[PDB]
Design a protein around this ligand. Structure first.
Ligand code: SC4
Lengths: 272, 213, 262, 262
């Protein structure tokens, strides 16, 4: 996040040192600066790379999900936690193979009457319950699971500033894997083809669990719908192994492609 | 509001225009009104018609911009791409900018590739039975293949085999011929209807026959 | 000089008289797990010279029409001597590698091969079903696979191939191949060098993992400039791949694993 | 080494991988006029980077039948960017040069070019009238001229050509060409080098002179050993000439000079 070096003045040359010539076969990039190939003046550099630090690049709340609940089973909804339901944050994360950070979740809740001239309801309160992989998932908008004696819940009152909570680095590995070239199972010799088969590039069937959202108020016959837009921001970021960015449209959770396979336009070789 | 009609064939050779009409309602009129065109297209991120004050050619040398610019109008602008090779699709977009809400528009695209030419030839001598007299409907030069249709006068038509496409320079070529069997007369207005949907009414070529001895 | 080298590992030595230096991926040389980064508590096995030696996988042939080749590690070495034995007898395994690609021609030949080492090299499949490639197809072993010039969707619903369909310009994963240079690599330009040498440390989000379930590195070879010779439309030059595992340590010994095949 | 170099002047850089050293004429590097050798009293203009940079003149082609080429300095650079502007706006001008001649072929080609830098390179005319060559013909500019294999007297009395008739073996001036080696030079022998590089200081009997009336240096290129290839009676290889003025200083500014042409 710092300063750039100054440009030193450089005069003419006539020597056996040729920085302009190189050999990219080695796998290295030629570290030339302007003064290597032209005469330069002294410039005191004041520009910095403060905004391109790994932290500043991700320091934005991106939408990862839009959970919908109809307060007239739709009285409650469950969202399997992921960053792949949307494309924008996903593409930025995928510039790297591994990552490690904390997360900040902000929830923007909106609601409205479906009918322009019918129904009425008192102010709604929402419960956003996190169900860690293993915990019982709600079957009804009002069954015993909503007691949350151990699961973390967030109760949001409609109209209040967006709710917000922080989550630590929760991975079971030392870093989050954006790419996993493997399987969760190894098919063994002799077992039925139905056996030992698993998805390519998938780890746990339930990585991070899911969110169960519901309106706590008793539902009125009035037609109402609410949407909880989930925004996530990685804070305290560290990333490893850069990768080229996604060039063609995403086709699922994997690196699969199908449709926009011809991303580049035509342009004449000798056309400026 | 956005009302672009551009779903255009699009004729090849070429050349034809690539228009963009944005009719403006009507009591909340639009500025700033710069117009952008993004191709579709390996767009990272330019082959662009942009027009701030003076029309700027983002480098695709083969372009023509015709709008009442450097002043204002605003934009029912027309573009043109010549030429003259099939730098095809893909697709094209047309996006505007606005002081009110309108830094936005719609992607809109279509066709290209090219029209054909036709002639009729009829021979040879009738030693039957029982094929060709013989009328051939040659169709030279059209990448999107022209639907050649041999018909005539009677039920002596069901007999129409095709030369498929062994393509010339970028452009596809075919030949439908008949066959039509045997025997005598000259003499009928046997008409080959070659289409392609360009020009005016489809290429209707009527001919005769080689009658011998 | 930058051009002459000799690599000795165990009982195997490699010599080259036309190198273009060597690349050490991410500037990290392979190493063993430190006590501060250790996870499994059992005593590891370290075969050393018996496993850390040069193994020559099958030779492929480069023609004017070749699109490219790919291999997965440790997969390509699963049947290689005592390295493969240790891999299958243990639940967990870790290793680094010295990849030496060989390709000689003459002063009248042209062509350039881009040799890339990719961590977590996930490839694209052939169906509309996501992540459908089956284990047997994803792990070809020493013979590896090939890149294609275009995507072709498998439509046989009765008998889906469940295979990869790596398109070359899309780097087999939906990214542009020209950007693959952000991964450790070397280029074998026929007018300059014979080979490419890459030293790969162990890369993963864990200190040790299952070698049978997970492939850490992928080796991709793409013809950047096609093979051409004098006037012989007909030209074929072999590309031999020699890889040596380094700092191998395995944990969790039990009965041997026999994976399902074909 | 003696063979690899890089020359940087202003915004232009030249690289070579097959040089045969460089020659600095008379061992003198170009310099500005010292106060002890100064003559015009007015403040000089020194364009520096705007004029002292590499300018590429037109490329000529060498064939088995070529006799040679010649250019005059500063004449050949009179239309070159800001150097030409300063030359024409000032009564007096002074400059040194870095002449870089380029000519590459292959290992199956032969030929040797003698590149000579001659101070006061006066050439012979075509008529019986002495010193009859006219200004327009003596100053061809960047296209320069050519040597001939024989002397041919212009007899058209009505319309005399008033041109030069430089015979090659007579060095275009009545002296034997084999003795032209007493002038700073280099040889571009195809089996050895790509180019010839000569650094020329300002040479004259005055500290500064009129650049329009007087040419200080002459560049002569003669095929010492003719061009030959494999078995192609037909062979053509280009010879490009890149020159950069050095330590330019002009005196006596007024309105621009527009010389008569053709
Ligand atoms: C590589 O990029 C990643 C890695 C992990 C991720 O998700 C991990 C994750 C695990 C638990 C929770 C649970 O968080 C919550 C809690 Cl306790 C209470 C209330 C609401 C929430 Cl929301 C949320 C996210 C995401 Cl979104 C991107």
């Amino acid at each position: 996040a710092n300063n750039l070096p100054d440009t030193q003045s450089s005069g003419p040359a006539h020597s056996k040192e040729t920085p302009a010539l190189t050999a990219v076969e080695t796998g290295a990039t030629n570290p030339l600066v302007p003064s290597d190939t032209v005469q330069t003046r002294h410039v005191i550099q004041k520009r910095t790379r403060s905004e391109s630090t790994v932290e500043s690049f991700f320091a934005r709340g991106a939408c990862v999900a839009i959970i919908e609940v109809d307060n007239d089973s739709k009285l409650f909804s469950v969202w399997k936690i992921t960053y792949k339901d949307t494309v924008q944050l996903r593409r930025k994360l995928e510039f790297f193979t591994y990552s490690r950070f904390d997360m900040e979740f902000t929830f923007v809740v909106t609601s409205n009457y479906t009918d322009a001239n019918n129904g009425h309801a008192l102010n709604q309160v929402y419960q956003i319950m996190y169900i860690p992989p293993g915990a019982p998932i709600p079957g009804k908008w009002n069954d015993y699971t909503w007691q949350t004696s151990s699961n973390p819940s967030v109760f949001y009152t409609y109209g209040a500033p967006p709710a917000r909570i922080s989550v630590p680095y929760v991975g079971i590995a030392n870093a989050y894997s954006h790419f996993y070239d493997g399987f969760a199972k190894v098919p063994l010799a002799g077992q039925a083809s139905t056996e030992g088969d698993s998805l390519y590039g998938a780890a746990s069937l339930n990585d991070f669990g899911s969110l169960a959202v519901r309106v706590v108020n008793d539902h009125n016959p009035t037609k109402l719908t609410s949407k909880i837009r989930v925004y996530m921001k990685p804070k305290h970021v560290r990333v490893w192994c850069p990768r080229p960015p996604r060039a063609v449209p995403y086709y699922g959770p994997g690196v699969d492609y199908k449709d926009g396979l011809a991303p580049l336009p035509g342009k004449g070789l000798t056309t400026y | 509001v956005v009302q672009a009609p551009t779903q255009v064939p699009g004729f090849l050779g070429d050349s034809v225009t690539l228009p963009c009409y944005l009719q403006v309602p009507n009591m909340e009129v639009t500025h700033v009104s710069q117009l952008t065109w993004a191709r579709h297209g390996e767009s990272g991120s330019m082959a662009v018609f942009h027009q701030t004050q003076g029309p700027s050619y983002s480098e695709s040398k083969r372009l023509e911009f015709v709008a009442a610019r450097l002043g204002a109008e605003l934009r029912d602008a027309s573009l043109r791409m010549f030429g003259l090779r099939v730098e095809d699709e893909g697709s094209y977009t047309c996006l505007f900018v606005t002081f009110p809400q309108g830094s936005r528009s719609v992607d809109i695209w279509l066709r290209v590739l090219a029209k054909p030419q036709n002639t009729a030839e009829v021979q040879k001598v009738q030693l039957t039975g029982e094929p060709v007299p013989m009328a051939r409907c040659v169709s030279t030069g059209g990448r999107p293949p022209a639907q050649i249709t041999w018909h005539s006068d009677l039920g002596g038509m069901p007999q129409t085999s095709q030369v498929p496409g062994f393509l010339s320079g970028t452009v596809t070529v075919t030949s439908l011929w008949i066959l039509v069997p045997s025997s005598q007369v000259d003499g009928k207005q046997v008409t080959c209807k070659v289409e392609h949907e360009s020009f005016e009414k489809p290429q209707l070529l009527t001919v005769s026959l080689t009658v011998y001895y | 000089s930058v051009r002459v080298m000799q690599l000795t590992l165990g009982n195997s030595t490699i010599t080259t008289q036309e190198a273009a230096n060597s690349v050490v991926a991410y500037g990290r040389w392979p190493e063993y797990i430190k006590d501060s980064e250790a996870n499994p508590v059992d005593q590891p096995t370290e075969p050393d010279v018996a496993a850390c030696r040069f193994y020559t996988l099958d030779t492929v042939t480069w023609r004017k029409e070749s699109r490219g080749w790919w291999w997965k590690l440790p997969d390509a070495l699963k049947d290689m001597g005592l390295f493969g034995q240790n891999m299958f007898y243990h639940y967990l395994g870790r290793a680094g590698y010295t990849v030496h690609v060989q390709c000689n021609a003459s002063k009248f030949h042209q062509g350039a091969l881009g040799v890339f080492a990719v961590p977590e090299m996930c490839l694209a499949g052939d169906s509309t079903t996501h992540m459908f490639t089956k284990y047997e197809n994803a792990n070809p072993g020493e013979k590896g696979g090939e890149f294609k010039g275009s995507f072709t969707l498998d439509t046989n619903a009765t008998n889906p191939a469940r295979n990869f369909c790596p398109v070359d310009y899309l780097f087999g994963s939906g990214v542009l191949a020209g950007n693959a240079f952000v991964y450790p690599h070397q280029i074998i330009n026929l007018r300059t060098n014979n080979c490419a040498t890459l030293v790969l440390p162990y890369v993963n989000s864990l200190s040790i993992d299952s070698m049978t379930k997970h492939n850490n590195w992928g080796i991709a070879i793409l013809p950047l400039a096609p093979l051409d010779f004098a006037t012989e439309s007909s030209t074929e030059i072999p590309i031999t791949l020699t890889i040596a595992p380094m700092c191998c340590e395995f944990n969790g010994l039990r009965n041997i694993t026999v994976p399902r095949t074909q």
